[PDB]
Design a protein around this ligand. Structure first.
Ligand SMILES: Fc1cccc(Cl)c1CNc1nc(-c2ccco2)n[nH]1
Length: 337
């Protein structure tokens, strides 16, 4: 009742998977056909999952999060497995998820398409947020879609160099995390959605900053320089002091930046791209905004079960994180259909 495994070298690396998975080809991640469900799937083999304390914890983190997500606009775990028969042999973790059509880069729209896509991102963010999970990293490339425009949020669980220069890895991040102004929270995801929604409407990056400071300048041009109250809340005195060096600018008219756009879109953007994260609209409030009248259904916008992440504040040995990851592998129950 443990399935039979077969071995196969791909991108210089040996993949050992259950017979159910066939037609493995690279995309480490491989596309495959799952003969038991009839689904096209992505299969990720984690590299050196238990090499260090930090990597062991990250592997546990990733497996906990994926095991938890059971929502249509969020990417779920279809299977998790290992070729090992015991903890002592355990050293490889394979994660199986749906293969999606295309990310949101490839796809860049009508106002109907923008409503439907942003609706879906918010529906999934409500679910994620209600479990006190923060995505941190929402961008077009973490948002996959199919032929029918049905959307899933991807990639849960970034160096100084990756975040430097003219790079998409920073264009969608909220200013408070981009510059470490304060202990940030869930609201940073809403900032990202604002950036994405703007991009879907204009076909152009909202804040294509050439570095952190240029981006901040582009941001402050649009939404205004911070006010007295927001300044108080910037915990970092070095950053607060830098902000105060800038000459004050008022919030621009959004109707004149997003010309031709549905006024309800303009309105929603204004509530999303508010500099003060305490005054940003929530995923749950956004869903009730008139812009989504076509799609809004308060009975089909579910929330998540509670998610214990007390493990985040725990300092454990490698073997202990590996043991905890083992338990979660062998306890995995697949979804029903
Ligand atoms: F996001 C995760 C997390 C854990 C494992 C895996 Cl394989 C993934 C990526 N999954 C996935 N990506 C896509 C996709 C399709 C097109 C662009 O992205 N479909 N499915």
């Amino acid at each position: 009742e443990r399935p039979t495994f077969y071995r196969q070298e791909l991108n210089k690396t040996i993949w050992e998977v259950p017979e159910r998975y066939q037609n493995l080809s690279p995309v480490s991640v491989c596309a495959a056909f799952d003969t038991k469900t009839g689904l096209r799937v992505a299969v990720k083999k984690l590299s050196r999952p238990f090499q260090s304390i930090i990597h062991a914890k990250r592997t546990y983190r990733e497996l906990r999060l994926l095991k938890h997500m059971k929502h249509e606009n969020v990417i779920g775990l279809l299977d998790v497995f290992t070729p090992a028969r015991s903890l002592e042999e355990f050293n490889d973790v394979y994660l199986v998820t749906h293969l999606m059509g295309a990310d949101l880069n490839n796809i860049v729209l009508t106002d109907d398409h923008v409503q439907f896509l942003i609706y879906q991102i918010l529906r999934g963010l409500k679910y994620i947020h209600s479990a006190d999970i923060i995505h941190r990293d929402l961008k077009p490339s973490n948002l996959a879609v199919n032929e029918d425009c049905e959307l899933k949020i991807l990639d849960f669980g970034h160096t100084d160099d990756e975040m430097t220069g003219y790079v998409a890895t920073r264009w969608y991040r909220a200013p408070e995390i981009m510059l470490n102004w304060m202990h940030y929270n869930q609201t940073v995801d809403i900032w990202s959605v604002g950036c994405i929604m703007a991009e879907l409407l204009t076909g152009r990056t909202l804040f294509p900053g050439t570095d952190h400071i240029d981006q901040l300048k582009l941001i402050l041009r649009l939404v205004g320089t911070p006010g007295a109250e927001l300044l108080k809340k910037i915990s970092s005195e070095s950053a607060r002091n830098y902000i105060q060096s800038l000459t004050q600018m008022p919030k621009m008219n959004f109707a004149n930046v997003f010309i031709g756009a549905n006024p309800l879109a303009v309105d929603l953007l204004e509530k999303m791209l508010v500099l003060d994260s305490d005054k940003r609209i929530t995923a749950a409030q956004a869903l009730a905004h008139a812009y989504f009248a076509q799609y809004h259904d308060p009975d089909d916008e579910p929330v998540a079960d509670p998610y214990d992440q007390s493990f985040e504040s725990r300092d454990l040995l490698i073997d202990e994180w590996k043991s905890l990851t083992y338990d979660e592998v062998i306890s995995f129950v697949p979804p029903p259909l």
